[PDB]
Amino acid sequence: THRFVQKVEEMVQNHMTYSLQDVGDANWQLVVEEGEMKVYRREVEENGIVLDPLKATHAVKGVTGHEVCNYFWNVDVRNDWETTIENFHVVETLADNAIIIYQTHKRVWPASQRDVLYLSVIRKIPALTENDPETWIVCNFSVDHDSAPLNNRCVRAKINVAMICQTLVSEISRDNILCKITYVANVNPGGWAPASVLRAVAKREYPKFLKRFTSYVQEKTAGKPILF
Ligand SMILES: CC(C)(C)c1cc(-c2ccc(S(=O)(=O)CCO)cc2)cc([C@@H]2C[C@@H]2c2ccccn2)c1
Numbered sequence: 001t002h003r004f005v006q007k008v009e010e011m012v013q014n015h016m017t018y019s020l021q022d023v024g025d026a027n028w029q030l031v032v033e034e035g036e037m038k039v040y041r042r043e044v045e046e047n048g049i050v051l052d053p054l055k056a057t058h059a060v061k062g063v064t065g066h067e068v069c070n071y072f073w074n075v076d077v078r079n080d081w082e083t084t085i086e087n088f089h090v091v092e093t094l095a096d097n098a099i100i101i102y103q104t105h106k107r108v109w110p111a112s113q114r115d116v117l118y119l120s121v122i123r124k125i126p127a128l129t130e131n132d133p134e135t136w137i138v139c140n141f142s143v144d145h146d147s148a149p150l151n152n153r154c155v156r157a158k159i160n161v162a163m164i165c166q167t168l169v170s171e172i173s174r175d176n177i178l179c180k181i182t183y184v185a186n187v188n189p190g191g192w193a194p195a196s197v198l199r200a201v202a203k204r205e206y207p208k209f210l211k212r213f214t215s216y217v218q219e220k221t222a223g224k225p226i227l228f
Pocket residue numbers: 054084085105107108111112113114140157159161185187188189193198201202205206
């Protein structure tokens with residue numbers, strides 16, 4: 001019971017209430033569709049800066065949500081799949097399922113480099129009823145911290161990202177399992193950046209990040225006991 005338990009609970013529950021809802025919803029603009037993966041955005045600017053909420057859904061054969069979330073959360077494999085960061089440092093271990101991370105992102109010309117400081121928590125949400133599936137969720141959201149590094153080259157972004165996973169099973173085989181992912185990211189670039197750049201990056205890099213990440217999960221897990 002670290003100092004962030006109540007805030008974690010609130011971020012997680014807002015995701016379970018809002019992020020999981022189907023989008024039908026003309027609010028969401030469907031931007032990219034490649035097979036199982038659908039990527040939506042809303043066009044939002046605050047103080048002239050692009051904030052466009054991003055939401056993707058995906059269906060990945062042969063993995064569970066527990067697996068997907070472990071791989072997304074576990075800093076030990078962070079460097080194998082991650083293509084967006086130059087460095088990260090674990091600032092603080094809060095619990096066996098919660099840490100605070102500092103990371104610097106690769107520069108995207110011509111915007112300044114960004115850094116981010118966030119709490120990352122992995123959580124299992126038991127089936128609400130015996131009909132409903134259980135859910136595994138990772139939430140990454142920005143927090144303040146006294147041991148925040150000094151990085152004069154970087155503008156501080158703020159993020160609220162969730163990777164939310166439900167598992168369908170049709171002796172259980174990988175052939176028989178399907179992980180349904182909803183992934184959401186609300187990123188505040190934290191100072192001026194060209195609108196066109198942020199939008200092209202999002203539109204090109206989110207589908208790649210997600211197909212790449214999930215392909216890595218399928219690969220790391222294939223022919224290994226199923227961790228439900
Ligand atoms: C533009 C866009 C795609 C919405 C964006 C997305 C991310 C982002 C953040 C976190 C995650 S994660 O899923 O929590 C995995 C651990 O990192 C994935 C992606 C970061 C930026 C950084 C703000 C900085 C930035 C600023 C200017 C140009 C390029 N990049 C911009």
